Structure 1
Amino acid sequence: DLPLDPLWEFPRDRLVLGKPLGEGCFGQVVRAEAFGMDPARPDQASTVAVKMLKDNASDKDLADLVSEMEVMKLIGRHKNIINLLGVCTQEGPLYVIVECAAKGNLREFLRARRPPGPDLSPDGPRSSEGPLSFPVLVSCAYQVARGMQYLESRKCIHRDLAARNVLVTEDNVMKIADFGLARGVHHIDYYKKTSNGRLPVKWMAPEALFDEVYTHQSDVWSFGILLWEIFTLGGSPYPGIPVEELFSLLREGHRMDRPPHCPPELYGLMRECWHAAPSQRPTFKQLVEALDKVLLAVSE
């Protein structure tokens, strides 16, 4: 019923729907098997993520998914974002087929890989050694910055950059997800807690929260929060601070403390991202270059 785009259109019969991954405000995500995503290999199997309308779908929901689809087409391909692979718009439900990151989002990736605590019996020569090291953490931050720099060059504002919206591949490559969504910025329930207990307001820049103003610099603020998440190994920002208290603290210019086991170089970048004036925050290009210096210095 939608117009046919032969550039992106993919035969829905070449999809085998599998386990549901989750869902957002609009549309659900289902893992699926795809055959011949690469036209040079028609019978080759690959794992993809399929976005589709729920059974609740109003047209507003359909409009949002169609809007997301067209955004995907225009942004282009980059290593550090979830890329569009194809769509299904003809003779059946609307499918938006995007890349699949095997290890889930960055927050859960970090939380599941926190080092063994004071309770484990020393078994082997690496008992104190956890899965996560400092240079890899820096690499995670650096890749997200590169991805955001690309999105910025494509004039794309994320408006909810967080560790939960950064996905991790089998090779630990950071991929930014859900960058092209209509997020209803004019009707945000600031007290709304997600099913996994997240308060999205804690990632909002002041100009976004108070003035409903969104720029790339507002994403830089959110990136600073994401930096805090990474080096707390998936910690929740503003620990033990309810939304009501967050409002007044932000008005007082309150900022998060330096997390434990976090070098001053990176807390310095966090605080720079949290400067009140958006113009006094680093650009993503500057963030990429700054984090690159740290990464190269620790990559002997």
Structure 2
Amino acid sequence: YGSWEIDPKDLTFLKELGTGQFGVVKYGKWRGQYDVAIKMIKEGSMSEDEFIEEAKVMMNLSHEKLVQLYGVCTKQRPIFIITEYMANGCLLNYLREMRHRFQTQQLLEMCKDVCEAMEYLESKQFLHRDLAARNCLVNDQGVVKVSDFGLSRYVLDDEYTSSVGSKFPVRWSPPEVLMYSKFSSKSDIWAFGVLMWEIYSLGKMPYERFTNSETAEHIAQGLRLYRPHLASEKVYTIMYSCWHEKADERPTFKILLSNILDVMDEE
């Protein structure tokens, strides 16, 4: 009915893609020809009425490096979220497949793709709030795109929303987030630096030998993730700059984009 509204009868379900915070995600066709991913929102997992109002704004967030929101199926339950389909799945799983034998130029291009999406979001004053390789997707061309931006606000699960919760993204959070719940564009910057570390580590867990509690203490004492073996000193300088103790001293995504482009030219 509405601009944001998709008729579920227009969907053909073809395969299960995975399960996330809101349940199963399937691959399908819209009106027989258009590839889509269909989030089948499990009951009690989402602030549905609030998400519905926000979907209108989220649908207007259009950028080549952002996994596009096509619409919603709300005249029912489970409600569906219809997005752009990405053939190569989750960036985290993609990084961990050692068969790709990624060259450093490919790893930087992944950082660049994410940075371009993040600079676009930053320009619209829209926070991702859960930037990580697990929330990035890869298309059939190996292009990396930012997925599920701003959806964290509609998660009803306290294990995910509490900074002391089991599902909270502790390892991707700056000190001010863990200490005072101070979220800003600079908490996305911090998460982007960690994502750069995940890319250059080929999907290793940040602070792999620590628990969430020990990571929070480590980070609050001014200590940081160290240089991945595949990261040059210039690349490590960029990710490190995201982790300044003072949020205001962290770069913007526009500054990071210029830094990534300069390194691309250097290597």
The two structures share one fold, judged by TM-score above 0.5: yes
* CA shift for structure 1 position 261: 2.9
* Amino acid aligned to 2:177: A
1:165-203 CA distance string (max 9 Å, x none): 11100011111011021156894153515xxxxx72100
**SS at 1:32 equivalent:** strand
Partner of 1:16: 12
Flag the 1:67–1:52 CA change in 2: closer, same or farther, 3 A.
farther
Report the structure, 1 or 2, having the larger helix content: 2
1:240 equivalent to 2:209? Answer yes
SS at match of 1:101: coil
TM-score by length of 2: 0.89
CA shift, 1:27, in A, is 4.8
* Counterpart for residue 166 of structure 2: 192
Indicate if the aligned counterparts of 1:68 and 1:180 stay in contact, CA closer than 8 A.
Answer: no
Q: Look up the equivalent residue of 1:94 and give its one-letter code.
A: I
Q: 1:172 aligns with which of 142, 156, 168?
A: 142
Equivalent residue pairs, number: 263
Relative to structure 1, the CA distance from residue 187 to residue 81 in structure 2 (aligned partners, 3 Å threshold; closer, same or farther) is: closer
* Alignment correspondent of 2:119: 149
Q: Which amino acid aligns with 1:226?
A: L
Identity %: 35
Q: Distance in 2 between matches of 1:68 and 1:233?
A: 34
Matches within 5 A, 1:154-233: 154-181=124-151, 182=153, 183=155, 187-188=161-162, 190=164, 192=166, 200-233=169-202
Tell me, in whole angstroms, the C-alpha distance in 1 between the residues paired with 2:87 and 2:134: 14
Contact 1:26-1:65 within 8 A present in 2 as well: no
What residue in structure 2 maps to residue 261 of structure 1? 230
Question: Equivalents in 2 of 1:46, 1:144: separation in Å?
Answer: 24
Give structure 1 stretches of 5+ with no counterpart.
Answer: 36-43, 116-129, 194-198
Is the 1:162–1:223 Cα contact (8 Å) retained in structure 2?
Answer: yes
Q: Tell which structure's C-alpha radius of gyration is larger.
A: 1
| 1:86 matches 2:71 | yes
Contact 1:31–1:49 (Cα < 8 Å) also in 2: yes
CA gap of 1:212–1:227, structure 2 versus 1, over 3 A, is: same
Do the aligned residues in 1 keep the contact of 2:105 with 2:264 (CA within 8 Å)?
Answer: yes
Rate the CA distance shift 1:92–1:243 in 2: closer, same or farther, 3 A. Answer: closer
Could you say what the CA RMSD is over the residues aligned between the two structures, in angstroms? 2.3
